Amino acid sequence: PTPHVVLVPFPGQGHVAPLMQLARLLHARGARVTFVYTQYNYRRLLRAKGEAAVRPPATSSARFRIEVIDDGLSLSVPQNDVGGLVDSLRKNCLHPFRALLRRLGQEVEGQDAPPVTCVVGDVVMTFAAAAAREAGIPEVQFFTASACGLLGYLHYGELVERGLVPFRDASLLADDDYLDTPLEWVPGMSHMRLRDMPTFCRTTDPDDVMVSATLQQMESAAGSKALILNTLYELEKDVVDALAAFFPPIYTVGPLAEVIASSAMDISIWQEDTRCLSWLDGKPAGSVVYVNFGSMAVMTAAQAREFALGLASCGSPFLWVKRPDVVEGEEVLLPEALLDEVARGRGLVVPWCPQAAVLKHAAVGLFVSHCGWNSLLEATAAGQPVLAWPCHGEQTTNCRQLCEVWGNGAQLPREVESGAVARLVREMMVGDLGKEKRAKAAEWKAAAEAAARKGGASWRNVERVVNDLLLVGG
Numbered sequence: 001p002t003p004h005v006v007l008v009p010f011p012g013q014g015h016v017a018p019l020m021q022l023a024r025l026l027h028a029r030g031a032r033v034t035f036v037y038t039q040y041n042y043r044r045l046l047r048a049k050g051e052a053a054v055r056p057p058a059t060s061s062a063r064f065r066i067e068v069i070d071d072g073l074s075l076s077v078p079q080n081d082v083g084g085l086v087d088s089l090r091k092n093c094l095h096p097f098r099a100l101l102r103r104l105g106q107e108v109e110g111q112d113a114p115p116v117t118c119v120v121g122d123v124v125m126t127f128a129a130a131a132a133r134e135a136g137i138p139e140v141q142f143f144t145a146s147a148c149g150l151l152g153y154l155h156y157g158e159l160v161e162r163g164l165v166p167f168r169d170a171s172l173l174a175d176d177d178y179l180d181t182p183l184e185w186v187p188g189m190s191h192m193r194l195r196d197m198p199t200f201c202r203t204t205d206p207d208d209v210m211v212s213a214t215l216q217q218m219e220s221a222a223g224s225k226a227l228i229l230n231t232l233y234e235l236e237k238d239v240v241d242a243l244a245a246f247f248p249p250i251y252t253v254g255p256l257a258e259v260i261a262s263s264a265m266d267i268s269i270w271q272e273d274t275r276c277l278s279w280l281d282g283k284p285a286g287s288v289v290y291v292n293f294g295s296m297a298v299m300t301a302a303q304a305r306e307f308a309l310g311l312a313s314c315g316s317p318f319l320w321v322k323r324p325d326v327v328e329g330e331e332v333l334l335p336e337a338l339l340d341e342v343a344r345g346r347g348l349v350v351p352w353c354p355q356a357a358v359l360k361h362a363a364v365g366l367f368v369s370h371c372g373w374n375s376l377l378e379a380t381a382a383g384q385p386v387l388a389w390p391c392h393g394e395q396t397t398n399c400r401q402l403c404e405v406w407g408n409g410a411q412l413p414r415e416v417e418s419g420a421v422a423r424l425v426r427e428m429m430v431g432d433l434g435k436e437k438r439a440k441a442a443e444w445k446a447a448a449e450a451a452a453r454k455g456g457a458s459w460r461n462v463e464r465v466v467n468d469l470l471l472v473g474g
């Protein structure tokens with residue numbers, strides 16, 4: 001009997017990517033896969049890339065099905081409106097997904113399809129677990145960010161109990177001294193501060209969507225058959241050991257993409273710029289500052305101007321991925337100093353890039369990052385030190401660990417100012433600060449390679465979760 005796994009990501013590229021990595025692996029191991037897109041995600045992909053690029057090839061098509069479910073969302077909802085996305089999905093997708101499961105069951109007799117044997121839901125997509133449980137189908141959840149981020153979200157309830165959420169004083173939401181307050185009660189992260197908690201706690205609304213949804217997600221995941229985390233156990237040991245008491249068995253599989261690599265579908269609305277890698281070929285080893293802020297976050301025009309002036313004054317060539325909609329508001333031209341550097345060939349601004357390959361390019365010496373988890377996994381595998389500017393969600397938690405525990409990064413202030421940007425980049429490129437972080441980055445690169453090669457800790461967890469849970473139906 002062919003196992004049949006249904007996978008359900010949240011509609012953001014950092015959630016689709018790890019679940020698609022897993023789906024491709026399961027297909028390689030002989031499973032039937034059904035990959036479930038929301039209509040929001042699917043229609044936005046089709047209008048950007050066309051159906052042919054988004055759907056599977058005819059070679060894999062027999063055992064790789066794409067299905068689309070209703071979500072009630074306008075395609076105009078932007079990726080930075082996380083609460084709007086989360087609220088519609090949790091309210092609107094359950095009954096469409098229940099109907100999809102029924103249809104897949106009818107296809108067993110109708111077309112000799114394999115019965116569904118497991119659902120793998122993104123922790124965010126709690127309806128997937130609810131529907132699987134109703135139907136008597138095992139379900140295993142996949143949290144797509146860091147273990148430290150999960151630990152933060154797990155303690156949102158305790159923030160509420162201690163009166164810290166919602167914020168009773170709106171003036172404290174951005175009070176840097178208040179946000180520095182230590183929270184000494186988080187197991188596995190004794191150095192947690194209020195600002196290090198994932199940022200959605202910073203709300204005065206007692207009915208805030210993201211706090212409510214996080215509580216639902218934690219309760220859902222606690223009831224799953226198992227939990228997949230795309231992280232390196234060695235990197236996050238203290239946090240994972242603290243998480244163990246609150247969840248089903250945890251499998252640390254990170255970096256999953258590297259486990260697969262050791263041993264045909266476009267998931268992005270953006271086109272990766274092919275000129276990046278050849279431009280880097282023309283630059284000396286370790287010389288280039290690479291800047292990228294992921295697929296969801298936005299910044300202000302003033303922040304963008306200060307980053308641009310900081311890059312022009314930092315002393316290094318740079319590759320800046322400036323996503324086309326990253327800046328709130330009307331288009332503002334880049335400063336003359338940066339444009340002249342681009343014209344001289346010393347800098348390059350592109351809309352989107354092949355990120356894993358860019359980070360592994362010998363010319364890159366530093367990653368200025370928003371601290372999105374997939375980006376940090378890509379930097380960790382590449383051995384690139386990180387200068388952090390966390391934006392939302394668990395990016396703050398990641399930044400705290402980068403700085404204080406993992407040791408492969410340093411942080412910029414939230415309020416971007418060109419002079420301080422240039423100075424911190426310079427310290428990271430030629431200073432003792434950068435030497436320390438780059439050396440630690442090299443250690444984590446070796447650790448990630450050991451974990452991902454055959455016999456390593458992440459490799460073993462991939463084999464166990466795949467063979468003992470995901471492919472075992474039949």
Ligand SMILES: O=c1ccn([C@@H]2O[C@H](COP(=O)(O)OP(=O)(O)O)[C@@H](O)[C@H]2O)c(=O)[nH]1
Binds near residue numbers: 012017354
């Ligand atoms: O120029 C870029 C920047 C990002 N990414 C991909 O977009 C995702 C970003 O996910 P992450 O978790 O880092 O952050 P998020 O986008 O969720 O904030 C990852 O798969 C990256 O490899 C990409 O393909 N090209």
